[PDB]
Write a protein that binds this DNA or RNA. Structure first.
Ligand SMILES: Nc1ncnc2c1ncn2[C@H]1C[C@H](O)[C@@H](COP(=O)(O)CP(=O)(O)OP(=O)(O)O)O1
Ligand SMILES: [Mn+2]
Ligand SMILES: [Mn+2]
Ligand SMILES: [Mn+2]
Ligand SMILES: [Mn+2]
Ligand SMILES: [Mn+2]
Ligand SMILES: [Mn+2]
Ligand SMILES: [Mn+2]
Ligand code: NA
Ligand code: NA
Ligand code: NA
Ligand code: NA
Ligand code: NA
Ligand code: NA
Length: 326
DNA sequence: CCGACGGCGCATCAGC
DNA sequence: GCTGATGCGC
DNA sequence: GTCGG
């Protein structure tokens, strides 16, 4: 990280616009600048130098000038000191508490962990779990633990049915040394863009994972998407492992590669690829890649049998997962 | 200069 | 009791 | 906040 100082500043500014100002587009503007700067191979020595990069405009070049000259940013100091900004920023660290709830609680005097505890009755099931594992969720997951988790999921899935295919994606697939969570992409021959809805395809797998006490809690659960909490088995007398966030998505089999691309990310990568795909006349989502008509109507789903196929369609140089960390 | 910047599955609950 | 509205996360 | 239109 030749420009870690600057990108950290841009990221903190982004979380502020998202959590406090509730301006999702400023949030995204800051992350775009941070991302583009993180890819720049030279140590930025001024705002004008950074200004050349797409995503970095007048205001960010100015903020960059102050940071290099002073080593800090006045705007961020004010933010850090402000009681409301700081409280809301802290509360959003709880899974289940977004910008709205955080602002709502603070206006009522609930601004700290203790307060959430005191007013637990006011929290919904998701927020209560988030409070319960506040520390655990902020811990990173060592890749070694991820592998152990990967073995258990594929194995338990296999038990339900040998034709299920579970693929760990997200940062893990990108080869990360550690991950914030575990993202599982699931498929089965019986569920395709046609099929006719197969009831409990995800339920069975979720159910099994709960059976062996791997999944300890549920945040959300439907026919195609599961968000929960899981935990590696604890030897016997040793220290329990930290509880971990787990997301599982069941997608149609014939849409596997678009799904793998999407769920492998990174998020910014997805944003980039989709915008680029539009420049080339295509429209991509997590399920398909379609050409855009002369008028604007999206055509039919094009065939895809590898991630590389998608890169080919948009004339982009294929990039291995480890290179999609933008 | 102004306005697009992605869109959706799931849970909750205000308004009736 | 129901559902349209909104939040949340990704 | 930024950039293309
Ligand atoms: N807002 C968004 N728009 C488009 N795509 C988005 C997205 N948020 C997440 N994604 C996609 C790409 C991520 O690799 C993938 C996993 O989503 P994720 O939130 O688990 C983050 P990950 O990249 O796994 O790193 P880590 O911090 O969890 O270890 O989901
Ligand atoms: Mn150069
Ligand atoms: Mn405020
Ligand atoms: Mn207090
Ligand atoms: Mn992840
Ligand atoms: Mn995830
Ligand atoms: Mn492009
Ligand atoms: Mn403007
Ligand atoms: Na620029
Ligand atoms: Na205070
Ligand atoms: Na949160
Ligand atoms: Na995360
Ligand atoms: Na009521
Ligand atoms: Na409804």
């Amino acid at each position: 990280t030749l420009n870690g100082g600057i990108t950290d500043m841009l990221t903190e500014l982004a979380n502020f616009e998202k959590n406090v100002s509730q301006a999702i587009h400023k949030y995204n503007a800051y992350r775009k600048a941070a991302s583009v700067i993180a890819k720049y191979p030279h140590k930025i020595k001024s705002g004008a130098e950074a200004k050349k990069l797409p995503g970095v405009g007048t205001k960010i070049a100015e903020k960059i000038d102050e940071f290099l000259a002073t080593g800090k940013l006045r705007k961020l100091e004010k933010i850090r000191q402000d009681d409301t900004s700081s409280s809301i920023n802290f509360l959003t660290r709880v899974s289940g508490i977004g910008p709205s709830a955080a602002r709502k609680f603070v206006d009522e005097g609930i601004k700290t962990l203790e307060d959430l505890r005191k007013n637990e009755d006011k929290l919904n099931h998701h927020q209560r779990i988030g409070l319960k594992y506040f520390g655990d969720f902020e811990k990173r997951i060592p890749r070694e633990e991820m592998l152990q988790m990967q073995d258990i999921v594929l194995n338990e899935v296999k038990k339900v049915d040998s034709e299920y295919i579970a693929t760990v994606c997200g940062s893990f697939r990108r080869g990360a040394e550690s991950s914030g969570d575990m993202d599982v992409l699931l498929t089965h021959p019986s569920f395709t863009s046609e099929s006719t809805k197969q009831p409990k395809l995800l339920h069975q797998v979720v159910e099994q994972l709960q059976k062996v006490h791997f999944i300890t809690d549920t945040l959300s659960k439907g026919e195609t998407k599961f968000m929960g909490v899981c935990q590696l088995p604890s030897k016997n007398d040793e220290k329990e492992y930290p509880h971990r966030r787990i997301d599982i998505r069941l997608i149609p089999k014939d849409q596997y590669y678009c799904g793998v691309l999407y769920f492998t990310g990174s998020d910014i990568f997805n944003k980039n690829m989709r915008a680029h795909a539009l420049e080339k006349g295509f429209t991509i989502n997590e399920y398909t890649i379609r050409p855009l008509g002369v008028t604007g109507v999206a055509g039919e789903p094009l065939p895809v049998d590898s991630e590389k196929d998608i890169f080919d369609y948009i004339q982009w140089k294929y990039r291995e997962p480890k290179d999609r960390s933008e």
